[PDB]
Amino acid sequence: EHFVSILGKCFESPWTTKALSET
Amino acid sequence: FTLAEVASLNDIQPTYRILKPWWDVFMDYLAVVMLMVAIFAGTMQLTKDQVVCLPVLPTGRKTNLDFQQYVFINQMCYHLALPWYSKYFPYLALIHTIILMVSSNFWFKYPKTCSKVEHFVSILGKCFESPWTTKALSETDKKDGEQAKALFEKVRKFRAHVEDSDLIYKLYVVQTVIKTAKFIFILCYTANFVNAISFEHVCKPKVEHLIGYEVFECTHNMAYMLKKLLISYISIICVYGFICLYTLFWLFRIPLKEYSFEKVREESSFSDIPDVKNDFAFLLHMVDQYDQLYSKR
Amino acid sequence: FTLAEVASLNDIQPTYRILKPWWDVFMDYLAVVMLMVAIFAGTMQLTKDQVVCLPVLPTGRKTNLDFQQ
Amino acid sequence: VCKPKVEHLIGYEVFECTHNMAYMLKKLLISYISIICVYGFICLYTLFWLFRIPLKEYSFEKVREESSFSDIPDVKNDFAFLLHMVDQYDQLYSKR
């Protein structure tokens, strides 16, 4: 349950795509 | 037993008013009607099914038979002198309706498929909730700017994601032709015995050293009601295959369906804000069949 | 007689679009269809179960019995 | 054909019944067995293949391959992770 919470909160972070469009 | 409100809850999509064209809604609603007719057939078949035989001449006639070999004799005739379609029809109709509805929507709940479809409905739902879009359309705060900037980045991430010879188009084509094959299958079968149903049945089983009376006849009890319910079923499936073959052959043949590039290109041509105007193997003109506004915005 | 409604609905999971492969879905829906076969089996089995015997012979042979035998 | 022991009750020893279920139950049986043969064949074969082959420890080098075209130094993922199986839903969430 907590693991699905990890990934379901992991997906929407805009910093992730800000750092993936960076390098 | 096996009612509509549990056959529906076997298989239903969560909330998607979008990604259902009008012909898909008529397929779903008419399949529910056909399941209602099949379950009414099952109830009426379980209610009053019994046959009744009696023998030939070799006032009234006595013949000296007790009641119990009468119920043996119409049991034995009921499993020998009946057509297979005289008593296996509603259960086969139930099976075929279940296969029809889940072949209507297993395109939609396939795990390689449902990912990008769920993600696309999430993209369009988040894309409709930005009031900057209607502000810029009013032309041609302070939060939706950076929200729409992050959503821009989601958009051209998603654009780079779904670019293959996709399983959406191929899966939907093979799904439609297999349910059309099921249509052709049952309407090829059922004409033969809507042509010939019967009310009275002569029978000659092998039970002669049990009672006697080698030739004797039954009447069956379904014939009028089951024949009328059968022709209503034929009408329903005729309308279903009509709508299915008509709209789906024309939607397969008239566009190229990878011309969503062309339709967003036309949209850019009259939109006064020239967009990227090119997209491959893409889903969006189904949403256009739902509503043009969710494609424009 | 363990009716079909709760036996169907006692398998649902709320948000797990993740954590199912293709065969989780195939095994799940296929077992639902097999449950439908079993429930229809139980209903039809309870409906018209009865057998009917009669004696061998050694017009209508009477053999002189009564219904409750 | 039945031979019950109730002889001092009616007077008959060898006689017969018919059974109302036989044809419907046999056809329902072969439908049930076709369903279960499909079930067991599919789930046996594909669970054999996702039992033997990835051996539940290659997700470390999988995340290393993930990093190998994302321009980030690689990390050794797991000892006990379900991240293979989430991978069978999407490659996207394993990348992301």
Numbering used by the authors:
A (entry chain B): 194 to 216
B (entry chain A): 2 to 59, 135 to 216, 277 to 433
C (entry chain B): 2 to 59, 135 to 145
D (entry chain B): 338 to 433
Wording from the paper:
In this study, we present the 4.36 Å resolution cryo-EM structure of the human LRRC8D homo-hexamer, the largest isoform in the LRRC8 protein family, which is important to increase the permeability to organic substrates in VRAC. The final 3D map was reconstructed to an overall 4.36 Å resolution (local resolution of the transmembrane region is ~3.9 Å) with C2 symmetry imposed, and contained six subunits of HsLRRC8D (hereafter referred to as α to ζ subunits). Overall, HsLRRC8D adopts a homo-hexameric architecture composed of four regions: extracellular, TM, and intracellular regions in the N-terminal half of each subunit, and a leucine-rich repeat (LRR) region contained in the C-terminal half. The overall HsLRRC8D structure displays a twofold symmetric “dimer of trimers” arrangement; in other words, the structures of the α and δ subunits, those of the β and ε subunits, and those of the γ and ζ subunits are identical. Our HsLRRC8D structure revealed that, in addition to the threefold and sixfold symmetries, LRRC8 hexamers can form twofold symmetry. Notably, we discovered an additional N-terminal helix (NTH), which was not observed in the previously reported LRRC8A structures. It is formed by the N-terminal residues preceding the TM1 helix and protrudes into the channel pore, as in the previous structures of the connexin18,19,25 and innexin20,22 channels, which show weak homology to LRRC8 proteins. The NTH is formed by the Ala5 to Asn11 residues at the N-terminal region preceding the TM1 helix and closely interacts with the TM1 helix. In the HsLRRC8D structure, the Leu4, Val7, and Leu10 residues face the channel pore, whereas the Ala5, Ser9, and Asp12 residues face the TM1 helix. The sequence alignment predicted that the most constricted site is formed by the Phe143 residue, as its aromatic ring restricts the pore diameter to 11.5 Å.
